[PDB]
Amino acid sequence: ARPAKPDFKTFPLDPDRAVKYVQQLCDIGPRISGTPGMVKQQEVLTKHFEGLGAKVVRQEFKVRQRSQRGAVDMTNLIASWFPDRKARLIVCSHYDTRPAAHQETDTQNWRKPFASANDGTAGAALMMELAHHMKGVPSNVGVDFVLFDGEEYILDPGVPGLQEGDKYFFGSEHFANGYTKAKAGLPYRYTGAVLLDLFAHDGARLAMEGYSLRGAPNLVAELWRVAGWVGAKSFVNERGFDRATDVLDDHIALNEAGIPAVDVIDFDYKHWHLLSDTPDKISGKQMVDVGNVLLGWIQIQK
Ligand SMILES: [Cl-]
Ligand SMILES: [Cl-]
Ligand SMILES: [Cl-]
Ligand SMILES: [Zn+2]
């Protein structure tokens, strides 16, 4: 041997394989909280992550959704990489699917299966792709892939203005509360989290929403800086979306627990909560770009 910007590289993420994982998860059928499709998804993901070197842990809990009396079983899944680390990052996504495509204006269409391809599913699929590479990634931080159950187990969507409807965010609230309770006894701390939501469509506009900006200014700066360096053109230095300036999502509970957390989202996704939110709406190149931004963010941590 002889001797030969923060140091990081892109990885050979496979865009076709990433889309195939979206298709595979959607081919389960709906993965509504508390259903056999969700159980099947958990098995698929657990086997995939373990086979690529991650340690997989379940966070099992029960809740009562507002419109129901029965309890629903919920399970967050955590696939952990690099255990011997005092600082850990989170890459997260929900993975339950909404019971109905509630943006359909013909309510008969609320009785049809909602595939939710770009909504939770694509984040899980990007984690499946990233898992092929993680054991080859140099990282000064731990990395936990966290899949939240029960983000939108919405059986009653309410009436806009008149009724709030069902509750969101069971899984992220459970995870964040568990961290708050355990933190003083843990040998690590979570120093940042990136939530992936509505991010994988062709030409996505991944803009800056307010809870992310307020909760995690340096995380936003690092992620968008990495995006500039890797050429991920979807990450734009602009505020908000047509649909909303500030977006409630799974990152709220994380920020409230003191974990800076950014939502990587295009809330103007045109197939949001429509039956047309299907795997053909996913861009493999967009998935690869977001994956490379996440891996660059991981690698630049001191
Ligand atoms: Cl390690
Ligand atoms: Cl909706
Ligand atoms: Cl920050
Ligand atoms: Zn949704």
3-class secondary structure for the chain?
Answer: CCCCCCCCCCCCCCHHHHHHHHHHHHHCCCCCCCCHHHHHHHHHHHHHHHHCCCEEEEEEEEECCCCCCCCEEEEEEEEEECCCCCEEEEEEEECCCCCCCCCCCCHHHHHCCCCCHHHHHHHHHHHHHHHCCHHHCCCCCEEEEEEECCCCCCCCCCECCCECCCCCCHHHHHHHHHHHHHHHHCCCEEEEEEEECCCCECCCCEEECHHHHHHCHHHHHHHHHHHHHHCCCCEEEEECCCCCCCCCCCHHHHHHCCCCEEEECCCCCCCCCCCCCCHHHECHHHHHHHHHHHHHHHHHCC
Burial letters 61-81, b for 16+ CB under 10 A, else e: bebebeeeeeebebbbbbbbb
Query: Shortest CA distance to 33 belongs to which of 83, 73, 92, 80?
Result: 73
Q: Report the chain's C-alpha Rg in angstroms.
A: 18
For the chain, give every domain's residue range: 15-300
Of the options 3.30.420.140, 3.40.630.10, 3.10.20.30, 3.40.50.800, the CATH number for the domain spanning 15-300:
3.40.630.10
Give the resolution in Å.
Answer: 1.2
CA of 131 to the centre of ligand 3 (A): 26
Residues with CB under 5 A from ligand 3 (ion): 216, 218-219, 260
| Residue among 97, 92, 90, 99 at smallest CA distance from 40 | 97
CA–CA gap between residue 37 and residue 39 (Å, rounded): 5
Note whether 144 and 79 are within 8 A (CB).
yes
Q: How was this structure determined?
A: X-ray
User: What is the Å distance from ligand 2's center to 175 Cα?
Assistant: 24
Which ligand has the nearest atom to the CA of 272? 4
Instruction: Name residue 225's amino acid.
Output: R
Ligand 2: centre distance to CA 89 (Å): 30
- Residue keyed to tokens 């009724």: 163
Residue type at 156?
D
Per the document, the length of the chain is: 302
Longest alpha-carbon distance in the chain: 72
* β-strand partners of 223: none
Ligand nearest to the Cα of 54, by number: 1
Closest ligand to the CA of 219: 3
* Alpha carbon separation from 243 to 73, 213, 248, 266, 270 (Å, rounded): 32, 17, 12, 10, 10
**How far apart are alpha carbons 262 and 62 in whole angstroms?**
27
Ligand (nearest to CA of 122): 4
What is the token pair recorded at 181? 């309770």
Distance, CA of 273 to chain centre: 16
**Ligand 3 center–CA 220 separation, angstroms:** 7
Q: Please report, for residues 23, 131, 184, 286, the alpha-carbon distance to residue 202 in angstroms, rounded to integers and kept in the order given.
A: 16, 23, 43, 6
Binding-site members for Zn(2+) are 119, 152, 273
Span from the CA of 264 to the centroid of ligand 3 (angstroms):
15
274 CB burial (10 A radius; 0-12, 13-18, 19+): middle
What does the alpha-carbon distance between residue 90 and residue 80 come to, in Å, rounded to a whole number?
A: 9
C-alpha angle 14/285/88, rounded to 5°?
70
Residue 119 near residue 148, CB atoms below 8 Å:
no
Which is it for strands 87-94 and 142-148: parallel, antiparallel or unpaired? parallel
C-beta of residue 111 within 8 angstroms of C-beta of residue 269: no
